[PDB]
Design a protein around this ligand. Structure first.
Ligand SMILES: Cc1cc(=O)oc2cc(O)ccc12
Length: 357
């Protein structure tokens, strides 16, 4: 009958007949081809224990991402620099700059915001280094921002610390397009980085900084903040949150990460924390957007809802789905599913080359 865990509650990535089997075998060594056990902590646990759990999850997932990137030949012909800038709280923000060696003029720029639920993972990590090199290789200038995290080794900094860091870093890059070899400038990211990407555009309109943004490309955005709702509430509003729950990511662990990001959840309905809540007023006048969602991702339906909201607001919006893809499959499986990876890289390349100032 119904797809995924709507039809059979025990279905997992391996047993869903829609999953790209290459990705199932790629996740098998880590035990990530099946549903994780119910998370042993919840959103009402003491914050000290939530931050401990997040620190562990970060160390484990950084291990998995390193192993998924191991065995690849490096992307050839990329020049890299690290710049350090002052953040708004006296923090240092690192910028990782990638460009094709020997470019003869300006190229489209990509301001890249990494995922990890705005709480964990480093832009310095091999999965994001690889993604920035791959985008640079197509003929772009990529700047990866290392913002404050809600948790883990770059934490703990609640909302809106990371968002403010992204703002300051975007302004720093915009101010320097000529010396950085940048034509147009696109803000892009996946999952939590998709969240900060969409919020960065909403915030830039409010603050009169839209000149910094020619385009927005959000992949598998993590934007509803609704992971802690009941199975029935989730199914009523965003059925993918039940259909594909536990497929690589789990609503129970995300619900912890929501509390970690915004302790006391005073921002649960604030579109700068959870862009799914954007009003028409928040989206009118925003520059061109792409929303890329993944077929067997529990976040699929909140990404589709955001595309619909952008269209309703008159934004020059596009959307695509990656068939057979779990959450972020198109950025994790460079080894096991290179065609899926290449297709997303090329779609982003095509988008940024389409823009004019
Ligand atoms: C790797 C990872 C990053 C995140 O922000 O959230 C998650 C949630 C999960 O259930 C499983 C993995 C992650």
């Amino acid at each position: 009958r119904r797809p995924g865990r709507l039809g059979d509650p025990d279905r997992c990535l391996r047993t869903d007949p829609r999953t790209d089997p290459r990705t199932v075998e790629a996740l098998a060594p880590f035990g990530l081809d099946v549903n994780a056990a119910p998370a042993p902590i919840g959103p009402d646990a003491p914050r000290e224990q939530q931050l401990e759990y997040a620190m562990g999850a970060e160390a484990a997932f950084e291990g998995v991402f390193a192993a998924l990137m191991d065995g690849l030949d490096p992307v050839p012909g990329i020049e890299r620099r690290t710049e350090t800038i002052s953040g708004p709280a006296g923090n240092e923000i690192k910028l990782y700059v990638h460009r094709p060696a020997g470019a003869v003029g300006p190229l489209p720029g990509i301001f890249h915001i990494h995922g990890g639920g705005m709480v964990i993972l480093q832009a310095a990590g091999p999965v994001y280094v690889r993604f920035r090199d791959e985008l640079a290789a197509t003929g772009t200038v990529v700047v990866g921002v290392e913002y404050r995290n809600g948790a883990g080794v770059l934490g703990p900094h609640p909302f809106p610390a990371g968002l403010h860091d992204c703002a300051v870093a975007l302004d720093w890059v915009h101010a320097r397009r000529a010396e950085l070899g940048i034509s147009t400038l696109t803000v892009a990211g996946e999952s939590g980085g998709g969240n900060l990407t969409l919020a960065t555009a909403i915030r830039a309109k409010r603050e009169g900084r839209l000149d910094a943004i020619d385009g927005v490309y959000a992949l598998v955005p993590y934007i509803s903040g609704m992971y802690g709702r009941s199975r029935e509430e989730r199914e009523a509003e965003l059925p993918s949150l039940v259909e594909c729950d536990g497929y690589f990511i789990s609503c129970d662990l995300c619900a912890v990460f929501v509390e970690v990001y915004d302790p006391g959840t005073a921002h649960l309905t604030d579109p700068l924390a959870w862009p799914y809540h954007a009003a028409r007023e928040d989206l009118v006048g925003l520059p061109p957007h792409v929303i890329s969602v993944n077929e067997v991702d529990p976040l699929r339906d909140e990404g589709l809802a955001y595309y619909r909201k952008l269209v309703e607001a008159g934004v020059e919006a596009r959307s695509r789905v990656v068939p057979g893809a779990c959450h972020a499959a198109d950025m994790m499986f460079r080894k096991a599913a290179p065609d899926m990876y290449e297709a997303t890289v090329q779609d982003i390349h095509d988008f940024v080359t389409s823009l004019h100032r």
